[PDB]
Design a binder for this molecule. Structure first.
Ligand SMILES: [Ca+2]
Ligand SMILES: [Ca+2]
Ligand SMILES: [Ca+2]
Ligand SMILES: [Ca+2]
Ligand SMILES: [Ca+2]
Ligand SMILES: [Ca+2]
Ligand SMILES: [Ca+2]
Ligand SMILES: [Ca+2]
Ligand SMILES: [Zn+2]
Ligand SMILES: [Zn+2]
Lengths: 316, 316
């Protein structure tokens, strides 16, 4: 819409109050003109037709419980845009400020959220397994990171390249959650998963095996479900990335941590420069070693920790 | 694009030659202005970013092997539009001539095709399990029928309503395949599935059990895979629809067939008037009985055959 840029206020899924960028033109719309070509949030009104209607509001105050998922989708797409711009100097997901669009209230009781190739889509959850999925900054950033991967490496969504795809999304979802310093941790989806149970999450990067995902290449899943285990085998890479950052000893192999910032620089370089659509885990290791080499030198501690972490999870 | 409407020629996935509606403006584009707000076919160029580029061609002749999937996507979206308009007096999937967009060459070796909420997407197959999926008119019509269902009943994509969703797509995909009289049959996906094996298909409506799908409500799948069995439990409804059309005796229950045309009128009425997002099999039976009643009278043979078919597959 063409209108005047303004600032409205509302409450997110978890009850927290936040200011959001809106546009006025008769109604106030969830349209943020301050970032790139804009961030636009739509109401899918419980249907599966997309994108639905651009979210319009009569008074620029978004405190209704139906508003909550929209506030957070719109706000956390902004934080994710800011992370990539400020940290990695990337303008939006295509590198050229493409507009970011998200639809909330997709379908009824839908327990998922996803990047569909053109925009973000968020279900409201059934209220038992999940609450509206846009309330999780690591979910939002995880899904927006699929758009980055689609425009750069192009990792196909199956077997080892799909598992890399998924792990890259977990890593950057987690780095965005630390960037916003939103009670940060190495788990995925803990703010919106099972409102009735405290302490659990969807996946764990620090200990993937807590939920039954593999933490070593010898335990990888080799069947056909989940497109060859893309959500299951991503645990092997997530555990490597946690070790590079935080350090630790894993199946007897010791890794000195180099921290989150360098972890993000190494993987972002590897994703945008060396990975290709059919990369598998062994070429991810070569790509990460080459990236750390480019950045810190072949005799650095950063290269040595990248090699130790992949050796610890059995990836040669 | 703005240009002049013209007619080009090409070859589809199966090697057959066909005329397709195109638009000229410097290049010839796959843009058909003769139907509704237009039918537009895009090249996703082996990436997952959508929709990709509107298909452009220098000489309006589409005989290259890369062109094949595009020719058939564009041509079979036209035939499906024509079926719904001519038979059911419905203008496009929203009933108001919405433009139909399709992208082909999606990803690499992708064994699937789908309606994503906004457009059609077709993989090229891996060449062993499938060949480019737009070469199957029943696949194209199956997926375009999800768009119709999304705008009308809105059946959610899980457990019994998702299985109805899937069966409705198989039924109308099959009726479009008979409408175009393209070697018609009651199987799904036989033209593009396993190029190396003759005689098989993806599903069967006349005998779902041939591939292991249930053909009676007592054999339904009750777990969690496939969103609660939406592709598996659709066999119960597909077998009912085959019996209403063709007749037969199934688990001892005899059904007089009333033919394909009335089958399509009863289900289209039931879909656009009585089904809702959470309809389950028992309410599909009530909706089909009410539709046949509206159209043919409560003491007709058409009502009696609808009841016998659902009684034959155990749906009360
Ligand atoms: Ca308001
Ligand atoms: Ca957290
Ligand atoms: Ca987290
Ligand atoms: Ca929980
Ligand atoms: Ca040509
Ligand atoms: Ca056939
Ligand atoms: Ca068929
Ligand atoms: Ca075959
Ligand atoms: Zn993902
Ligand atoms: Zn389907």
């Amino acid at each position: 819409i063409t209108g005047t840029s303004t600032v409205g206020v509302g409450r997110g899924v978890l009850g927290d109050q936040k200011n959001i960028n809106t546009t006025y033109s008769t109604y106030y719309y969830l349209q943020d003109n301050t970032r790139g070509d804009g961030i636009f949030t739509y109401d899918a009104k419980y249907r599966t037709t997309l994108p639905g209607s651009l979210w319009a509001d009569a008074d620029n105050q978004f405190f209704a419980s139906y508003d909550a998922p929209a506030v957070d989708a719109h706000y956390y797409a902004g934080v994710t845009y800011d992370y990539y711009k400020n940290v990695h100097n990337r303008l939006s997901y295509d590198g050229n400020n493409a507009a970011i669009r998200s639809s909330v209230h997709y379908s009824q009781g839908y327990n998922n959220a996803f990047w569909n190739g053109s925009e973000m889509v968020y279900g409201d959850g059934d209220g038992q397994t999940f609450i509206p999925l846009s309330g999780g900054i690591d979910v939002v950033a995880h899904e927006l990171t699929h758009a980055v991967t689609d425009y750069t490496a192009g990792l196909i969504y199956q077997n080892e390249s799909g598992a890399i795809n998924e792990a890259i999304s977990d890593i950057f979802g987690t780095l965005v959650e630390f960037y916003a310093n939103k009670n940060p941790d190495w788990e995925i989806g803990e703010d919106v998963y099972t409102p009735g149970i405290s302490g659990d999450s969807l996946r764990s990067m620090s200990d993937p095996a807590k939920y039954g995902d593999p933490d070593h290449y010898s335990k990888r899943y080799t069947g056909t479900q989940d497109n060859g285990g893309v959500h299951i085998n991503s645990g092997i890479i997530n555990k490597a990335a946690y070790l590079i950052s935080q350090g630790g000893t894993h199946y007897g192999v010791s890794v000195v941590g180099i921290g989150r910032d360098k972890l993000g620089k190494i993987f972002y370089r590897a994703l945008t420069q060396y990975l290709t659509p059919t990369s598998n885990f062994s070429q991810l290791r070569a790509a990460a070693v080459q990236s750390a080499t480019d950045l810190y030198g072949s005799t650095s501690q950063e290269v040595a920790s990248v090699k130790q972490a992949f050796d610890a999870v059995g990836v040669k």
